[PDB]
Amino acid sequence: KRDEALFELIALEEKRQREGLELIASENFVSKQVREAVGSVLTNKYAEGYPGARYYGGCEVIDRVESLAIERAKALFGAAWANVQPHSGSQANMAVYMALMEPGDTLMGMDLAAGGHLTHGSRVNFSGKLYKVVSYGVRPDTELIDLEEVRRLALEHRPKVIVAGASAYPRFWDFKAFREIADEVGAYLVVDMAHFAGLVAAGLHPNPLPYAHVVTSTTHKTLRGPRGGLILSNDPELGKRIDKLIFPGIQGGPLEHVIAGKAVAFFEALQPEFKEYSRLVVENAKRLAEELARRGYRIVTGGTDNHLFLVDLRPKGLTGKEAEERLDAVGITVNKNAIPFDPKPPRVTSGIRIGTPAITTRGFTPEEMPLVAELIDRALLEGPSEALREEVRRLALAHPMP
Amino acid sequence: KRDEALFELIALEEKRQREGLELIASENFVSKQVREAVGSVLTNKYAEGYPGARYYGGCEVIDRVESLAIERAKALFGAAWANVQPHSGSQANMAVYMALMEPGDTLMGMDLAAGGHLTHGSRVNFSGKLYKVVSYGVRPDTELIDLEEVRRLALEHRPKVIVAGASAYPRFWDFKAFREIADEVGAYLVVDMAHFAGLVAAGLHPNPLPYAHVVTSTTHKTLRGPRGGLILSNDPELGKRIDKLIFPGIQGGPLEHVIAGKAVAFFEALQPEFKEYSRLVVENAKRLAEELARRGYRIVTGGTDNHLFLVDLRPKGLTGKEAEERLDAVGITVNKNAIPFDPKPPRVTSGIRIGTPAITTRGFTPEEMPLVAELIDRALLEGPSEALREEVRRLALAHPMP
């Protein structure tokens, strides 16, 4: 008997994705072949352990799948070791922290209000519950990270782990300087590259692998893979410690169907076409930010080096909750986002974050960003309307989905 | 450009699954429509938060999917609250432990060597790293749990949490007696029903919901759903606390394509045909155990109440490691398992664990269990041969996969 009610909801979600403009910076649209691998019979096999060292027999083909994902990840990022089993970016970070730290050690990460991720030390997250957290932010004038401030805080508090990487920071990171700071205090440098991993893969963002002790990531977001996590290092002895924290430390059976999807995504990212895609992601983001600034919006830091940017909505009298609602009403999806030194609580905020990976996958070009900027501006100034919703829908439908 | 190398391996794994007899008790084969949901475009959406209270716009359809999974889980198991976001059984347990305990509190669970899971207190797992662990086992003379010993340990060590449930225990649990013991020392009772959840759904195993404070599960194994976790309770106030530990406590974005898969599995399990399937699972296991006993093996506890049983190989002078290897060589997968107070070290053991869910899904019936018992016996006594492998392969191919 087919579950018609559930499949009707999936069809409605397909239609929603096709008919809207998805500008949430962490989203993307995966390829049919990634979906085919994730939908495969590999879900049926328990594969606790690692290739050639499994608990149970019958894994000879699964070992070749997992090993292919591991070796492609090493080739793609230039790493000596990879672990492809984490179920999510959160589990990747959790295993690394538990391998390098004991409860009550000091973790240093970027402040949530400045663009850090929940797992970089928030007090409602395991990171800020198990560890003592010290956070760094950005300067109030340039809105850039101040490496002198990072260095001062590290000397004063002597963290065991310093995390670089963030979920809403629009400029490049200086990984060499962060490693120099970590070395001054004997800390490990962990880089969480989840947001910009696909740009690293395409050579469009500095690679952290040579400077970080350990690198974590998601396989979704700019890498355009299935939802899951990933860990890399140039030190295979530290990698063996972390392998034990993934299993048997914090997970049980890995999702081998998802791992097959990660292998496929790494193969897609190794192709020349993925470099061209990634180039257009960054060109579209720069162009859309410029078109919005020409309409009088304030862009945090004045621009972007990567796939995302932040808009300060204080001057226009909007909370980010409000802008998020007005845009959602006409089919444009963003997320509210705290801006640097935000006057308003995190459930309201003063800004929005926009990113271009998802619309670039649908074939949007830099010459189309003036039209996208017009639609955003109208939704914010004039509020939602049926004519505006229809204009968004027409523009979205003119671009294929993968 | 298609990833030919990866899809070649998926076809080889499909062929392996089709041509072999899967007797590992944790395994099952999911339906095509569960795969279709897991392979869907719902992976593209970030949906941090809960239905009606998300951190991203554009979740109106995903909310209906996740709500449908929640309401079907509650109707299927007779629960007042559910959380369908855990990425795995291990994350379901981790969130419950962190919601109920502080690091350094005492956890009581079944010993790994007597059948407990890694997350019931093993020192290599987070459960034995964050918490102090007291374990209970089985009695040498009954091969069963001794509720008087559980009580004595609980009175002496005053655990904060007592876990009931196991990965390799072939008899019913007395959840009422466990809740009495927990009430006497002021502990929470957590039941991990992952292995026998499908039998609870079908009414063939006592339901823990009225007696546990919280129930955790996988959605794969006897429930025959996609790989993932699940939490249930009869107490919605405790459920709100655990919701917060799943997110933002230990996870980030949920896997909503897998959640849609869980919704389909719960739909399948609510059909009358699932009760018939589960009845056959239990009849097959009782019959296979009787047929091996008639050929000279001893069955631990003398039989089974559920989908799995433990074979004591001592009458035939084999170890569990040798039996696993001989059987794997003819395409029959089992796993070695210690017998109570095993005289062999744990990397060797004197037993194997066999379960029937997977072969029952392929249409095996109790009148075919004599033939399966004969093939096992021949492989253990004669050793692998090309002719025996071909007889297994023909028997397997005659029973279709879903």
Residue numbers in the entry:
A (entry chain B), B (entry chain A): 6 to 407
What does the paper say about this structure?
Serine hydroxymethyltransferase (SHMT), a ubiquitous PLP-dependent enzyme in the aminotransferase superfamily, catalyzes the reversible conversion of L-serine (L-Ser) to glycine (Gly), transferring a one-carbon unit to tetrahydrofolate (THF) to yield 5,10-methylenetetrahydrofolate (5,10-MTHF). As an enzyme in one-carbon metabolism, SHMT is essential to the synthesis of thymine nucleotides, purines, methionine, and other essential biomolecules. SHMT is found as a homodimer in prokaryotes, such as Thermus thermophilus (Tth), and a homotetramer in eukaryotes, such as humans. Like many metabolic enzymes, SHMT is evolutionarily highly conserved, especially in the active site, enabling us to utilize SHMT from Thermus thermophilus (TthSHMT) as a model of the mitochondrial human enzyme.
We further tracked the substrate through the active site cavity by obtaining a room-temperature X-ray structure of a pseudo-Michaelis complex by soaking a TthSHMT crystal with D-Ser, a non-reactive enantiomer of L-Ser, which displaced the sulfate anion in protomer A occupying the cationic substrate binding site. The crystal soaking experiment produced a complex with D-Ser in protomer A replacing the sulfate, whereas protomer B retained the sulfate ion in the substrate binding site. Both protomers remained in the open conformation. D-Ser, the enantiomer of the physiological substrate L-Ser, did not proceed to react with C4´ of the internal aldimine thus generating a pseudo-Michaelis complex, TthSHMT/D-Ser. Arg358 acts as the primary anchoring point, forming a salt bridge with the D-Ser carboxylate by making two H-bonds with the N···O distances of 2.7 Å and 2.8 Å. Tyr61* that interacts with the D-Ser hydroxyl adopts two alternate conformations. In the pseudo-Michaelis complex, Glu53* was observed within an H-bond distance of 2.9 Å to the D-Ser hydroxyl. In the TthSHMT/D-Ser complex, the D-Ser α-amino group is 3.0 Å away from NSB but is angled away from C4′ at a distance of 3.5 Å, possibly making the nucleophilic attack unfavorable and producing the stable pseudo-Michaelis complex. Moreover, the Schiff base out-of-plane dihedral relative to the pyridine ring is flattened to 20° indicative of NSB being protonated and positively charged. Because H atoms cannot be observed in the TthSHMT/D-Ser X-ray structure, the protonation states of the cofactor and D-Ser cannot be determined.
